[PDB]
Amino acid sequence: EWIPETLYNTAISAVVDNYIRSRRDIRSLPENIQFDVYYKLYQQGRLCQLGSEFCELEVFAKVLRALDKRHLLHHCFQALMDHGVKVASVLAYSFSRRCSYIAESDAAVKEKAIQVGFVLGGFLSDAGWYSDAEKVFLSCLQLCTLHDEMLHWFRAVECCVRLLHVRNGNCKYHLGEETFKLAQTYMDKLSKHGQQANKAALYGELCALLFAKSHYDEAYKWCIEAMKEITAGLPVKVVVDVLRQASKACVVKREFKKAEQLIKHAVYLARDHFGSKHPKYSDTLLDYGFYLLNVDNICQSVAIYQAALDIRQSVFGGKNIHVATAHEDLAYSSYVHQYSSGKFDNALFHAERAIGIITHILPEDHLLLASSKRVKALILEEIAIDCHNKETEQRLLQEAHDLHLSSLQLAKKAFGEFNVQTAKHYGNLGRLYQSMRKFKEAEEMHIKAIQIKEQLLGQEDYEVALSVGHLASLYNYDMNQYENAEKLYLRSIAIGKKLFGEGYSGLEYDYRGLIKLYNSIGNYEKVFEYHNVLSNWNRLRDRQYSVTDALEDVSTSPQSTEEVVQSFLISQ
Amino acid sequence: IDCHNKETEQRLLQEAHDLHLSSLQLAKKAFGEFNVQTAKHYGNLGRLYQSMRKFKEAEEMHIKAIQIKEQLLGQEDYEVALSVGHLASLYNYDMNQY
Amino acid sequence: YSFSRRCSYIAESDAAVKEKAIQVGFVLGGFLSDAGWYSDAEKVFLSCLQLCTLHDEMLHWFRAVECCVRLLHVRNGNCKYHLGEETFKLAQTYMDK
Amino acid sequence: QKRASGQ
Amino acid sequence: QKRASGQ
Amino acid sequence: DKDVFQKFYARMLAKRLIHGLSMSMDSEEAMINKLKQACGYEFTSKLHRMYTDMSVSADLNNKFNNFIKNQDTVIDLGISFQIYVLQAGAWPLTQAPSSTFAIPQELEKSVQMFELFYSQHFSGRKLTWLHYLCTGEVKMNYLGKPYVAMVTTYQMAVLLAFNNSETVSYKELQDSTQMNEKELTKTIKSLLDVKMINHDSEKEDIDAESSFSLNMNFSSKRTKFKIT
Amino acid sequence: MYVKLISSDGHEFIVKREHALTSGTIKAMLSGPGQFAENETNEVNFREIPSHVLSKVCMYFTYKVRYTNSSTEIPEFPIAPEIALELLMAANFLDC
Amino acid sequence: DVFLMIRRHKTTIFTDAKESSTVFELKRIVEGILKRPPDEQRLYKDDQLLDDGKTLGECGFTSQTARPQAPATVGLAFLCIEPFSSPPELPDVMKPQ
Amino acid sequence: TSLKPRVVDFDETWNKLLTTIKAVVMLEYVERATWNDRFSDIYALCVAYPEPLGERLYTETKIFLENHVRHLHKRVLESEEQVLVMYHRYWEEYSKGADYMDCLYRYLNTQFIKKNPLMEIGELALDMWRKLMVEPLQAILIRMLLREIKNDRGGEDPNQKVIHGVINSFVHVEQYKKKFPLKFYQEIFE
Amino acid sequence: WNAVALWAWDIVVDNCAICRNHIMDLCIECQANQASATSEECTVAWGVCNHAFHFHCISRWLKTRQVCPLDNREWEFQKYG
Ligand SMILES: [Zn+2]
Ligand SMILES: [Zn+2]
Ligand SMILES: [Zn+2]
Ligand SMILES: [Zn+2]
């Protein structure tokens, strides 16, 4: 029944127990034994004796090369940062000091301080501590750009493409633009000497930067060059990153046919080369649930975010920015899923968790807090309208008002006034004011959002059409201007039928809006007409919607890497 | 009892019901059926049922608690007095068995 | 856990080392049981009791009784009542002998 | 309060 | 309901 | 210590009810009901489940026989199949027979039919077959007189393997049922005590080499009896 | 049937074949030229493992084979603190 | 079951003999490795000689003190048994330098 | 002594490993001293201070296996019409040497190959074989095997050990590929 | 051939996570009041997450929270025993 424990683990439990008398002699052990000892220091709960050994680069750089057991490390590190020890900040400071001490030293020694810099930067970027992986990459870039040889050119290019990711992920897009300009200059200098390096990762990261900035046309163009730059010798992680950014740009560009294949191949490749419980696979699922949510397949989306949050809780502890974004995405997909049913208790918990995390690891004035403050308030308004107590709904509306105004202020501070994300915030706040009996300014908020979306998204986008339907529903039930509501319903229904087939989820809400409007005016023939149309929509939805798990749908894709990129290039 | 809401009242009654039943399960598993603590949980659950307007279940729980305590503590005890007072309050105010 | 491991290691020694270990265990178990960590105090008192069963001297019997009386206090506070009767039976066995 | 104190 | 979902 | 009495009473009630011996079915109810009145329902909740399991079993076997009757194709089990369903949370006979058993193909048709029936009649109730609580009759027509004896499922597998061939190697017998040898030593000695199977091997002891052959000289005083 | 182990200090430790099969690298020791029939039984010499840690490894072998898939609460193997570090590298080298 | 090692100044013979395997079976096991018939070599223990017919159980050599994790030792002479090359000592840390 | 991670120059140690492997792969009598020295030295090779140089050891190890298989491929090509028997015996010797290598690269397989991607040392020899011996001669070696199977039924039964010592060769080289555990045996011969 | 079959619910875990009782035994609500009156309908209710509890427990659980107690996922029934 009881298998005897191995000699290795018993000696590990003996070295750890005799830890203080042999603390300095552990660092002379093999890196495998070193990681096993420092993991036993975490299993036993000796977090304070581990936060003084992982807090030094003489030890941490000697344990980051445990590539077989790295997820365990991601659990230890995320414990220490949750414990109280600022391991990320102290590791960044130690690396900055080491780089300053090495800058005048020999160039051969300088490169050994870059490979240690790359592994530590990649780890601290994977763990979600971009703000403390930014200093590591800045020191790496400076140390590489002190001299200008070909190897230093390549190292500077790699550090530039890595530093854009840790800058874009921290919502520092303005510095990301300058970082990309520096990368462009460095690659131009490299190409002027006849040496060309693959820039697919750089272009995909720029696509992420612009998609965050909501420059969808430019993001899609850079996606086109990124997919043109894809080769066969690239590492799989770079390919997955490029495909994931390609998918999440093509979805927002409303090209659901190509983005479907892109994201399915991305998920399949992440599952094969990495595993079912890898952080990169978790990110691929988190951006695959985005695609599934934006192609009217809301329900399956919840089955993907929950399959992407559960990977980032097993790997990234409990207080992380990578589990915070998974929480906020699952808090929003469940919010859309249970919009009709009113089952927002789960979607509220997954939104308070993201708020309680980002408010703890990020400052108040951070854009990532704005997105999570949004979703929590959208669940807050949906609970409030279903709430019966007038004081409860009043205070919930006030809390949602505070959350939307804070999110809008943050979005205006970072993005600007005429951006798509700010327009989405305006539309959400207009819906909130409609729920708050402030209709006169609610119509103004909807009009401002519609104008901002039209200035950028045009008349053929679904994002503007959804707020058009929101404003028309405001007009029908609470403004009585039935002509504007009718024309905006017509535009929204036309766009929805053009894009999302014939069984789009909001089409039912639009049809009920038309039915109530036509009942209000008095014409009772078109009431029966659109009642029949609503029944037609219901039967199409019933005979179209099939409950199929997405993970088994992507279980074995018969399409390889070359075929996907070839098909994407052929389509463009 | 004090709150004038109805949905909030029902939710709080259900929460108290879950807490009482989990506590009763823990006491019943670690102590057995024939102990004073299990009977106290029975009596508290009966009082809650009386608040939950489940007067048949309330009198059933109170009868079980009184029987358990009387079998153990005898026919006279302060806890038995509290239990019979609770059952009398149930009878003379809710079930009208005077 | 550290005290249990060191206790199991120095169980094979003379009476002086065993006395020192049992006294360290008494003060540590008294502290942990006083702080509240009853579940983490049995693991110390069980090791002390294991030390007290190796020899048959008078002081060893008396300190086994002390282990069995302190070990009963860290189980009533932990609500391990099904083991408290066994602990009392062990203590009264030691008292009878 | 219609009944005595809880047990 | 009377209004569509989020965006 | 009334708890240890319930545990002791459970083992004998399980043996009394399963083997079919009982003075009267109503007396079992009265004894269970008297304890329920004398020590509370929780004391006899397990015991009451054992009694009601037999009561449901009579009703269930009517339904199972009705189910096999109302079949699209003609299904015949080929044996007087009898089953009682027992709740796993009440009976004390849950001693796990983790030793793997290979039920013979003659009786494989019936067990598969009941699994199909119970899967659709009741949802979520998996069936665990306690093969060492089952007994059945075997038609011993190999000798001159068709002797009738009661053998268990464990004994049935050994006897059925001897129907086609008068001698069966002990190596094949232990691999036909693929279970532990130590149980088979006391399994087959019951047939040795009644001399149902002759000791074909010259070795006095019983091992894997001890191949056995049918006993044609076996005589039974009673036409119908039970092997124990 | 038996195998003899040589420490780095010249000691000799003789233990059964199945007892020494617990270590992964001992199986590699006895897979190639280490067999040499049964002239002096299977023979293995370590040029880096001292005598005390090899004695502890052999005692661990005895503890492992005796307590393999036991139905009783196994006692903990006593790796004393003064040898814990040396035994840890030995255990990892031997893949015990 | 009694676990022990046989050391003649350079070797170590781990064995798993029972209590009935007093002496002669142990010497047969030794014969199974390096011959050395009992007419020339006799086993020893802590500067004492064990009789061939004497049972090991009664002479303070039971299975309780002969666990595989820490087996008792017996000498051999064809005594000056060499030590096990004792490990380097480690600082006590709590000592005042 | 000194189980601690030491520092050692790769030149002499890799030369010693080269000599031992050259004495192993062709199945020669290898002394115990060299065998145990290689076991105790590959450990220090994989944990050499300060940077564990297991990657280098893997690199020159696969380079040596590559050039050895290339030399054996040239030895097969320089022989004509008798490649079947020499190929069978060379394959048996090389498989035994690959098993001896997998046993010999014990610590590097356990604590460097699994951490990385890279492939197992024991199947590195098999992969190098099947990609440099079998792959260029995918039809030369089966040129006479397929016709003798027809000759077996009609007029000339072949030698049993010659025809069976190669029919299992294709299965062994795909013992690591999970996706194609037996497909290559069907693909190239069946 | 008389045979004995121990039927049981095919849940791998033997503990209704809401009431801590064994999955085969009556729920804590059925063992509190309905113990002396009537106790035969206490079945199990599975879910999409395949975490099955006592039907009297999960239905009692859904009166306050609409999530599976083990894993905080949305609760939709899929099978009843
Ligand atoms: Zn701390
Ligand atoms: Zn329950
Ligand atoms: Zn129930
Ligand atoms: Zn669940």
Side-chain angles (χ1 to χ4, degrees), chain J residues 49 51 68 71:
Chain J
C49 56
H51 276 165
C68 185
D71 45 346

Side-chain angles (χ1 to χ4, degrees), chain B residues 13-29:
Chain B
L13 281 184
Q14 196 56 231
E15 285 173 22
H17 195 229
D18 306 353
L19 296 199
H20 273 103
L21 267 169
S22 70
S23 177
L24 168 62
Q25 209 286 318
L26 293 181
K28 196 167 89 70
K29 154 175 86 202

Side-chain angles (χ1 to χ4, degrees), chain G residues 2 9-16 19 41 50-52 55-56 58-59 62-63 66-67 75-78 81-83 86, chain H residues 1 3 5 7 9-16 29 32-34 67-71 82-90:
Chain G
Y2 272 57
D9 283 8
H11 272 74
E12 184 146 338
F13 292 90
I14 300 179
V15 72
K16 302 211 294 213
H19 270 92
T41 65
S51 300
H52 44 277
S55 63
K56 267 292 186 181
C58 294
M59 283 183 276
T62 63
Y63 168 73
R66 155 71 197 94
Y67 281 92
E76 191 168 2
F77 190 65
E82 68 272 15
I83 63 171
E86 272 170 341
Chain H
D1 212 328
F3 294 83
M5 74 278 284
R7 307 181 36 80
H9 307 83
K10 281 298 289 184
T11 57
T12 292
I13 314 295
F14 280 98
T15 184
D16 49 352
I29 294 301
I33 309 180
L34 300 173
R67 271 175 325 274
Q69 65 183 177
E82 308 175 24
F84 274 99
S85 177
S86 82
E89 67 269 15
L90 74 164

Side-chain angles (χ1 to χ4, degrees), chain G residues 26-83:
Chain G
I26 290 293
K27 187 184 315 272
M29 287 271 194
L30 312 177
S31 295
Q35 304 223 310
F36 286 166
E38 273 313 306
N39 298 115
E40 72 264 0
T41 65
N42 284 157
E43 83 292 356
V44 173
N45 171 35
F46 309 97
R47 70 197 55 238
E48 287 182 354
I49 284 181
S51 300
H52 44 277
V53 293
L54 194 53
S55 63
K56 267 292 186 181
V57 163
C58 294
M59 283 183 276
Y60 164 70
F61 288 149
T62 63
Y63 168 73
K64 169 74 181 294
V65 175
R66 155 71 197 94
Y67 281 92
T68 300
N69 61 39
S70 174
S71 290
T72 68
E73 263 288 277
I74 54 170
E76 191 168 2
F77 190 65
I79 296 165
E82 68 272 15
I83 63 171

Side-chain angles (χ1 to χ4, degrees), chain A residues 37-51:
Chain A
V37 168
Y38 294 131
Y39 189 41
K40 200 66 177 202
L41 277 175
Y42 163 65
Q43 304 212 295
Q44 289 201 347
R46 293 148 160 255
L47 286 166
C48 292
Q49 287 182 353
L50 182 60

Side-chain angles (χ1 to χ4, degrees), chain I residues 33-48:
Chain I
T34 308
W35 187 257
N36 284 251
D37 194 15
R38 293 318 170 282
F39 282 174
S40 181
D41 212 357
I42 188 172
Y43 168 75
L45 274 156
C46 300
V47 68

